[PDB]
Design an enzyme around this catalytic site. Sequence first.
Site, PDB file in Angstrom:
ATOM      1  N   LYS A  21       7.055   0.722  27.947  1.00  0.00           N
ATOM      2  CA  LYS A  21       6.211   1.481  28.879  1.00  0.00           C
ATOM      3  C   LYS A  21       6.477   0.975  30.276  1.00  0.00           C
ATOM      4  CE  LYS A  21       2.140  -1.506  28.140  1.00  0.00           C
ATOM      5  NZ  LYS A  21       0.771  -1.442  27.544  1.00  0.00           N
ATOM      6  N   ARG A  81       2.524  -7.574  15.040  1.00  0.00           N
ATOM      7  CA  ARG A  81       2.458  -6.132  14.761  1.00  0.00           C
ATOM      8  C   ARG A  81       2.671  -5.318  16.030  1.00  0.00           C
ATOM      9  NH1 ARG A  81       0.173  -4.811   9.427  1.00  0.00           N
ATOM     10  NH2 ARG A  81      -0.156  -6.893   8.502  1.00  0.00           N
ATOM     11  N   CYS A 123       0.831  -2.243  18.235  1.00  0.00           N
ATOM     12  CA  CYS A 123      -0.406  -1.944  17.590  1.00  0.00           C
ATOM     13  C   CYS A 123      -1.521  -2.851  18.181  1.00  0.00           C
ATOM     14  CB  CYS A 123      -0.201  -1.970  16.076  1.00  0.00           C
ATOM     15  SG  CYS A 123       1.136  -0.801  15.529  1.00  0.00           S
ATOM     16  N   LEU A 175      -3.670  -3.019  21.164  1.00  0.00           N
ATOM     17  CA  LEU A 175      -3.939  -2.435  22.534  1.00  0.00           C
ATOM     18  C   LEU A 175      -2.953  -1.342  22.968  1.00  0.00           C
ATOM     19  CD1 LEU A 175      -4.787  -5.550  24.755  1.00  0.00           C
ATOM     20  CD2 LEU A 175      -6.387  -3.757  24.014  1.00  0.00           C
ATOM     21  N   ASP A 176      -1.710  -1.413  22.502  1.00  0.00           N
ATOM     22  CA  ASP A 176      -0.756  -0.329  22.719  1.00  0.00           C
ATOM     23  C   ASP A 176      -1.096   0.915  21.833  1.00  0.00           C
ATOM     24  OD1 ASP A 176       0.843  -1.447  24.703  1.00  0.00           O
ATOM     25  OD2 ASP A 176       2.410  -2.196  23.382  1.00  0.00           O
TER      26      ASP A 176
END
Length: 146
Positions: free
Chosen positions: A78, A113, A116, A118-119
Amino acid sequence: EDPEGSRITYVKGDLFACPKTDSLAHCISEDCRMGAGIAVLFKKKFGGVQELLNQQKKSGEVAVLKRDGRYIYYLITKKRASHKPTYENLQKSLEAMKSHCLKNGVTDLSMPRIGCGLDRLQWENVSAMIEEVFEATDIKITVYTL
């Protein structure tokens, strides 16, 4: 009878206590800000912020540090830390990591992980993606959860 074994092994424990020969991976933004979650610990343990920025990697790429004879992979998923990643950029970044692994002899990766929490991606999708990306390699992945 020649068992491949699972691509991904799951461990409850501390990612940073993985074998010192394993390479490590996690996800960051193009801004290389590492102020939340597990990234805080990557920053403390490995540093490299300006070195990473200097690589000028964009979403869908991977920035890399060499630390103690193995690699630390920064999957750039991102533009900014407050944004959410697309699956499309995560896939591209994983492919980039795979190609570096193969070129540099990396056979074992440890990661959280990725994507997974907060994303806000779904683990079932990410695990399937990892399986697809690493099919036909002998790179094994250990995924750590505290």
